[model samples]
Target: GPDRTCPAGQTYDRSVCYKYNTIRRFCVANPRSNREDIKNTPCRADEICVQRNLSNGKSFAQCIELVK
Candidate 1:
């Protein structure tokens, strides 16, 4: 195959060009837990973390792409 190159700020993963994105979900923090307690998963170099609330009266931490 010919040489493959991605545009600046994009990454080649699994034969696709993708920007840093997070698609992992994590449970929210536990009440009364230590302030330093961590329940978050690290996103890849192409992802960012965000917080979301659900109808179950719980919140979640997750990673998502920057485009949307």
Candidate 2:
């Protein structure tokens, strides 16, 4: 059987049988930087910066459950 593991910063939701972020912030405010400072900023478990494939064309909440 395949091992079902959640991605970093996300957790599995048995009800939906998918991985979802723990916090829920649709958007975050931060200044542009050349470093990885955004990674250290506080975000809701469900909120995340627009990721490549995860948030390609979906809302933050939609991406939360489907994002890898």
lDDT of each: 0.38, 0.29
Worst 10 residues of 2 by lDDT: 30-39
The TM-score of predicted model 2 comes to: 0.15
- Using TM-score as the measure, the top candidate is 1
> How well does candidate 1 match the true structure in TM-score terms?
0.27
Model 2: colliding residue pairs: 22-45, 23-44, 23-45, 23-46, 24-46
Root-mean-square deviation of every model:
16.6, 15.7
> Per-residue lDDT tens digits of candidate 2, residues 21-46?
33332222222122111112233454
Give lDDT tens digits, candidate 1, residues 1-68.
75333223433221111232444333223332322222334456646666555545344455654443
Evaluated at residue 34, the lDDT of candidate 1 is: 27
